[PDB]
């Protein structure tokens, strides 16, 4: 239930491959204390796209506060940065511009796509639009929208942390596995199947 | 520059100091997502079903 | 080994060993305490889902900045880079080895004191200058050469702006400064001085409205920009420690340290200092950052003459009251 | 006192050994920065206090942030410097070195000719520098600040970029 | 005296916690953490000849700090130097101040052109 | 009623600022007489063009259904003709210019933004300044890259 990822420098150049969970208890503990502090303070690159930036700097201010789950401090460099969020379309322009800022990331790093032009090029099926994100860097996360309401990418920096704290990464770089293994987790779709089927009756859209 | 400008100039920067203080003494506007649940009008464009007839069969 | 004077050396060194914990500690926590005040200052909350009231949040952090990938540039220099942080820490910490907290309290009761604090401001420059420098980065080049003009600028008259309390207390120590205000506190007669050491020790802070990183975004143009992991939560911590000894000093030299009428003297430090942690929050939160030849100007044509007459005239009144 | 006194004075003289034998200009800077802190400890020794400040204060906070800051504006990537390394060469160093070599053998023997009853460390507060300073030497007082003027006007006027 | 010993070890014993305890931040920051590569990770983050100006205004820093010196060292004895003193450095700030405004006038301290 | 705030003569950044403030009362007023006076009618034209039709018409006239069926599918039909149409946008004047060949897609669309001459408006004015000074001016103008590029 999980997949193994090492990199060695087309897009993404990383290999991918599906292996058993290897998880002494003091290890194991040690681990979840990093996945803990990882995922209770993500630092987001401040990355302006287009109009889902502006929904995720809405996110950010005060009548959401997004400086809740400890993902305020917002960075302008990629260096200081956990988290990219493509919150905007793939321009061709603009891709390698993506491809340069998440290499210049270091680890751990993941990567949200918010909105429809993130995951999928969106409306934008043109000559000039990257026909999504995932083209050229992996991504962790997908929110679809245009634009996905600014809780909607707090439920998937929700969803990005249960996604970290139940990954396992190497604590050193000098002992033990420095592989990357991932959790290979129940879509939202199938958890969700049971409570989205059972809706019978909504509100008729004539009321406020 | 003018001392009258210097004067005004600290004098409203006083002021605004003061007028964020009165803002920190206000009520929080935050709605807290997820422990509380987001209110949404009954004709708002999300997620995407196909519904049933009163019969019970699909209406598609 | 048992004798007194062994036990007073004993004590005296647990005593600094838990001041400087206290102050690495309070830094930290004021890091977490400046996001916590300014959500209350935005009308929100701020951090309070890592354990009860965000309490957690720094913990969090710390594990992540520690954990973090700690990387150097191949084009950078490899000990001016590993040592900016170090300085950016290490100087405002040992600016603070001489505030004493309370009577009997203090690590170093220097013949110096606020000289020695003017040592360690004027070392702290060269955290600054080095981040810039060894990065190899043009942008940060340029943008830590502001950064440091403007502490110039300001640390011009920071000394001139104590030396009012000096002339008034007639010496360089910290405990005869604090003494001194046991009838009258400092910022009543050192008003100007008051003021201009504001200005001089947000400045050389790098804090709001004078912090060059925040000041200019688009250009991508500020010296932290190459720093992650450690090194640039060292950055963080050494800012957050200097706010800390700034606002300490700013307490024993003005506003007369711990002397009070009913509450034991550490308390009163404590409240008076954090006071002006709050304020350094609402200064953060409330002022707009003005330009950079506004900023110097500021600096040099209006502060120093200030300082200057600020001492001249506290020298006149102290040998007009001297029969 | 007098350890930390040894153990500085051995800290300057080898950055001093390190600057004068340096490539990189930031390098040199920062070992003659070491130097000046170690001969501040040297001066904290000594008992004069209000000397040591002034060193780390003036002397390694505003000279060597000028040195610094120039150093930085040259943008020294070593230009025909690194690449001649004409100093390290040794027909061109032997000559030099043997000169202050000599000299300075010459002015230890005229040091250790003389009486020395030793240093007591009796500290020399910043009040008695002070008190002598606007006291027998005042016409010094106004004719330094008049001489950092004419340093202020000569280098305004040298080191305009128009 | 022993309290005086016990405050340089204390003092010395603070200078050098706070130095380890950087340096082990340093330390655990290195050795903890993995590290993975990437092509353009090498290269410095620009966003995917300078002026005499800031020479001059160091080297006025550096001039108004020895003269700060000299007012620092007056500052710590103004009592025991009474108004004769007082007079001395009366002239000392006028030459500092006219010395400053001459810098003003000639655009010196302006930084914009 | 609604008054149309003006300058002196100079185009300041301050000046675009406080002008863009007296907009916002001014909309405000525009929402008070809207709200106070908003007709009782229909939300839809009686145009055999209206796309789409009035939905319960659709949802129980064939007719209706017929119209909203091609409407919806293939596209209405707009006669060959060319048609322009320039606003206020909340930035400056929009303009859309639509030529139409006859058929249910556009043959030209043509949309005029005004950040597109702000952008090009800035080398001009930002000369002999700063770059903060330049800060503040693309804070200042009230531009989006989405209507520059478009
Ligand atoms: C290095 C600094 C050198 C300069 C400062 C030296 C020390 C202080 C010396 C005294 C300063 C007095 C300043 C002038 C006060 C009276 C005039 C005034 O307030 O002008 C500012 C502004 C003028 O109004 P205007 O900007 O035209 O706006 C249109 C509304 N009529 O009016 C307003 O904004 C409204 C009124 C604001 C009043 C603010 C408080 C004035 C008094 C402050 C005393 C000290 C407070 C210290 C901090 C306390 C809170 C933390
Ligand atoms: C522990 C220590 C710290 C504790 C925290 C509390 C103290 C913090 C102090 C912060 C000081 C910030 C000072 C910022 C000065 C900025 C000066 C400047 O450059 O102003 C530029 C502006 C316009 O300049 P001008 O040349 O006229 O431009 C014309 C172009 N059209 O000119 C103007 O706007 C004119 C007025 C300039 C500002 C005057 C000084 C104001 C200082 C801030 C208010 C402090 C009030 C007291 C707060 C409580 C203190 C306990
Ligand atoms: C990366 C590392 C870089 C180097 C870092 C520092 C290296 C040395 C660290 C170990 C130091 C051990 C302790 C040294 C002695 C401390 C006590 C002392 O100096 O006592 C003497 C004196 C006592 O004063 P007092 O009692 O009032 O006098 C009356 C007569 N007893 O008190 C005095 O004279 C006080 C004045 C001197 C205090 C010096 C403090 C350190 C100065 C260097 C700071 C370096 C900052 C970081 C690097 C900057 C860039 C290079
Ligand atoms: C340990 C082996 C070497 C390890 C590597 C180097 C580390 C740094 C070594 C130099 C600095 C520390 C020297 C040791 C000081 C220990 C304390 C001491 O000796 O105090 C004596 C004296 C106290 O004052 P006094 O009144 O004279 O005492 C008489 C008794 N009543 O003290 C005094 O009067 C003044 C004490 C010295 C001045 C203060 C500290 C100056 C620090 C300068 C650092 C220079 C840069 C070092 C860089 C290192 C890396 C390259
Ligand atoms: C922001 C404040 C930082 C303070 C750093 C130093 C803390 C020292 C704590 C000393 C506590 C004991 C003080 C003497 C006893 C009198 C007070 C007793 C009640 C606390
Ligand atoms: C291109 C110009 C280069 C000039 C280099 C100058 C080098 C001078 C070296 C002097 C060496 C003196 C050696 C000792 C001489 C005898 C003892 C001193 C005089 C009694
Ligand atoms: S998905 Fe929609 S809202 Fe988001 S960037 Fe694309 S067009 Fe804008």
Partial sequence: ?208 | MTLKELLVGFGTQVRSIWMIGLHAFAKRETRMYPEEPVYLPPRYRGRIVLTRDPDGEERC | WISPELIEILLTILKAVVILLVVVTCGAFMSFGERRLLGLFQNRYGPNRVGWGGSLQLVADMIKMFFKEDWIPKFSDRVIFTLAPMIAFTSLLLAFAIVPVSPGWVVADLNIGILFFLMMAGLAVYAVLFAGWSSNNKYSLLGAMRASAQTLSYEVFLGLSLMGVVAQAGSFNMTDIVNSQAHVWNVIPQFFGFITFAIAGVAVCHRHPFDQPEAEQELADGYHIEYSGMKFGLFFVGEYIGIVTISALMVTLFFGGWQGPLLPPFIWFALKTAFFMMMFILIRASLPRPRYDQVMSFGWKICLPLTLINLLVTAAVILWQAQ | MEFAFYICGLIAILATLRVITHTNPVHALLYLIISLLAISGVFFSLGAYFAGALEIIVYAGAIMVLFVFVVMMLNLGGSEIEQERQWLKPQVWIGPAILSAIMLVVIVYAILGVNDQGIDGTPISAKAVGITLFGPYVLAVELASMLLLAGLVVAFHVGREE | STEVIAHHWAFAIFLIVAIGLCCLMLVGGWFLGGRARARSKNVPFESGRLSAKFYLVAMFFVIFDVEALYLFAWSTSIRESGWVGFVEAAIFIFVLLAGLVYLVRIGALDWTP | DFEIPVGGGVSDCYTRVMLKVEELRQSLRILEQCLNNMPEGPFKADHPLTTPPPKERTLQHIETLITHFLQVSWGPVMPANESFQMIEATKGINSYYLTSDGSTMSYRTRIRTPSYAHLQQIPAAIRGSLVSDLIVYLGSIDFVMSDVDR
């Fill in chain 1, 1 to 208: 239930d999980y997949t193994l990822t090492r990199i060695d420098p087309r897009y993404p150049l990383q290999k991918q491959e599906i292996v058993t969970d290897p998880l002494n208890v003091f290890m194991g503990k040690l681990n979840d204390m990093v996945n803990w502090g990882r995922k209770n303070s993500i630092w987001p690159y401040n990355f302006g796209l287009s109009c889902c930036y502006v929904e995720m700097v809405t996110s950010f201010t005060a009548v959401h506060d997004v400086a809740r789950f400890g993902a305020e401090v917002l960075r302008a460099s990629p260096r200081q940065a956990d988290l990219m969020v493509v919150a905007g379309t793939c321009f061709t322009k603009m891709a390698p511009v993506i491809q340069r800022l998440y290499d210049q990331m270091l680890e751990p790093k993941w990567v949200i796509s918010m909105g429809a032009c993130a995951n999928s090029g969106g409306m934008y099926d043109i000559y000039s639009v990257v026909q999504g994100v995932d083209k050229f860097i992996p991504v962790d996360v997908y929110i679809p929208g245009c634009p996905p309401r600014p809780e909607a990418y707090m439920q998937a920096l929700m969803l990005l942390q249960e996604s970290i704290g139940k990954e396992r990464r190497p604590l050193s770089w000098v002992v033990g596995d420095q592989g990357v293994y991932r959790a290979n987790m129940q879509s939202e779709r199938e958890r969700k199947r049971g409570e989205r089927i059972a809706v019978t009756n909504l509100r008729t859209p004539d009321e406020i």
